[PDB]
Design a protein around this ligand. Sequence first.
Ligand SMILES: C[C@H]1O[C@H](OP(=O)(O)OP(=O)(O)OC[C@H]2O[C@@H](n3cnc4c(=O)[nH]c(N)nc43)[C@H](O)[C@@H]2O)[C@@H](O)C[C@@H]1N
Ligand SMILES: C[C@H]1O[C@H](OP(=O)(O)OP(=O)(O)OC[C@H]2O[C@@H](n3cnc4c(=O)[nH]c(N)nc43)[C@H](O)[C@@H]2O)[C@@H](O)C[C@@H]1N
Lengths: 367, 368
Amino acid sequence: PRISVAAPRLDGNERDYVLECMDTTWISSVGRFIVEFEKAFADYCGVKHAIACNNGTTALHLALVAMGIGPGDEVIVPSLTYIASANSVTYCGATPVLVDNDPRTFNLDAAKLEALITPRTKAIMPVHLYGQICDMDPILEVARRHNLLVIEDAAEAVGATYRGKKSGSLGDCATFSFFGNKIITTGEGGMITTNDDDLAAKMRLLRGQGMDPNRRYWFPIVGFNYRMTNIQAAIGLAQLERVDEHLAARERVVGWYEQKLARLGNRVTKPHVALTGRHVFWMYTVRLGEGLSTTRDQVIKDLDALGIESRPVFHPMHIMPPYAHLATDDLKIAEACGVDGLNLPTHAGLTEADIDRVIAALDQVLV
Amino acid sequence: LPRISVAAPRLDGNERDYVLECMDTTWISSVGRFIVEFEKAFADYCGVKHAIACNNGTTALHLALVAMGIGPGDEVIVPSLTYIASANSVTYCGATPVLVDNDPRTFNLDAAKLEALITPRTKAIMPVHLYGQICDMDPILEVARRHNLLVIEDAAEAVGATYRGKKSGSLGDCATFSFFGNKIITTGEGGMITTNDDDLAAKMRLLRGQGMDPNRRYWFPIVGFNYRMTNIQAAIGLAQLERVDEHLAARERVVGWYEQKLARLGNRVTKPHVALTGRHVFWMYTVRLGEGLSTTRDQVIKDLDALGIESRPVFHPMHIMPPYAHLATDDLKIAEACGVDGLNLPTHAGLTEADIDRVIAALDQVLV
Ligand SMILES: C[C@H]1O[C@H](OP(=O)(O)OP(=O)(O)OC[C@H]2O[C@@H](n3cnc4c(=O)[nH]c(N)nc43)[C@H](O)[C@@H]2O)[C@@H](O)C[C@@H]1N
Ligand SMILES: C[C@H]1O[C@H](OP(=O)(O)OP(=O)(O)OC[C@H]2O[C@@H](n3cnc4c(=O)[nH]c(N)nc43)[C@H](O)[C@@H]2O)[C@@H](O)C[C@@H]1N
């Protein structure tokens, strides 16, 4: 049987809640679950406001637009990330300023921020890869000192914490994704968290085609159609109800990899865990050893043939066509990680036998 | 006394079943079989080669325009009388809309005002088939062709409509539809692009999927978007589309009722004119208030609401609102006249003959 790199576990009230939507006929972007989901997600992150959106990409765009990011502005974004992070900046007419990441946590290197600030910088986008929150204290300190905004792309870290705070409550705003491979899913769906009244209002106005609440077909600004549906919210609220279960499940999966690792010896380097809060392990990510004869890419092809799905750590932005014009000589760790990084199957339905197969496979494939 | 809504989804087919299927199979994201299935049924319905499912008709519009290469410094002719997504979608591209006036009877793009708005920057024209009625496509296509311009139909309100033998979605280079809750066919939130051009279609699909190389994980040749429709939306859409004919017949019957009963109102409303070019699907039955009335359009909508009946105004033309006031010209009068006197009456598959008598009775009481 095939082992998927990811998959949602719909073991709560998803089905009943969706049925209710169907049965009530509230299936569009108008229904109770949207507000309920938002209320509950806000409460779960300990922030005042949650804005449900259509996906974690339009969440990023919407948050940046509402923040006033536009032509001329610069936003610092790590090169090692999912493209939506830099794409969202480009949609605004703004310019991404790529920064290197840490070789252990894969995350934005705070020590490299300052050299990048210019008179055009407006925000910094820490991205919490693989379930692990960036070292926020120093990023916030650099930001404060420069009157910059911080937006967390927290799409891969729902439930993670940093020094007592949940992801989503640390920067001026944060975005999350609920695509089907994420910790909690809505199928496709996203959310923006923030504690700022103004920012939140602007986001809801923009999300809703920019229409004015009191005048039918009265639009004061150019908006977007970024609403989530009642059905996405229903699924979402149900998943959030079992969020701790979901998280305990990846902890079970990670515990299995962690205790079987020695069979791989120095052939992989295991995901390093910063001691700053909970690391949620959206994906259990290793760096293959410099010494193999095989290539990270061939490794994925071999595993596939072995019936196991896996993914590469992202290709850094500045090595791909859309962003090669942004390359600098100080993006070496991103390059290295993109080269040797591999996401192993990590989801709530994996059994210990699954994990045993993944380990056996790699033992065989890493030459 | 339950309220009569202007619109409402009629989920009287296999929507629930298909949707439970998605749940039971765990395929609820933009990965699942109903997507391709729906696209295929829809393309066949419209008589075209390709259908690209998207998360709403606004992003369908943006997607189509980026795929057609609309960009900064390009002009796209858009009617001022339309839903804002029409003009916003061009804006998203960094392109400039060039407003055109509409026909006073059909509410549609006035092809005779088209040629004059063409410049060195024009790249496309976007006819909008308001209210289920297809624009007079022949003359529009003749001008487009003569100046080598693309044509994108904004067919959101016209699923099922036909024009001189062809379905909406099949006349310009591409077309877009909306499956928002109040649409003829719904997916709650959803949209579609139709096209017979292989190239355009493939570009759309690449952009719609975050611009990722289908043969190279996390390798992106260009900047794309997250515009994919989910399996659940696609399941509702397929089921809806399965009963497209019943849905269009339900509406015809309602429109028949308005047609028969409106005489009780006399010259107090102007009944929507229907061109003999093809099938008018009546997403909304639209009247223009009598010029003779003492009352105002917004007052009539207020009075009906109070009477427990929902209604909507004909769209405020883009040039009169803040985001586009800068595009105003002195030749958008009919659009203005229409935004002033137009009213969409409740139009949907769940309305009964008694509901209509009630609506007509309310008009009789409030059109003073
Ligand atoms: C990190 C990147 O993940 C995704 O890319 P990718 O890794 O290529 O996604 P893919 O479509 O391949 O799905 C990832 C894994 O989750 C799976 N999957 C996604 N949606 C579903 C779902 O609704 N049901 C089930 N069962 N599996 C799902 C899928 O089959 C696969 O094994 C991007 O969409 C979002 C994100 N930025
Ligand atoms: C012309 C414009 O219509 C919409 O604007 P608006 O007229 O303000 O849509 P509204 O949210 O008022 O909904 C229209 C009617 O359909 C109803 N409706 C929408 N979605 C649903 C749904 O999922 N279920 C039910 N039963 N009714 C729905 C809603 O209650 C209302 O009576 C836009 O979102 C897109 C569109 N281009």
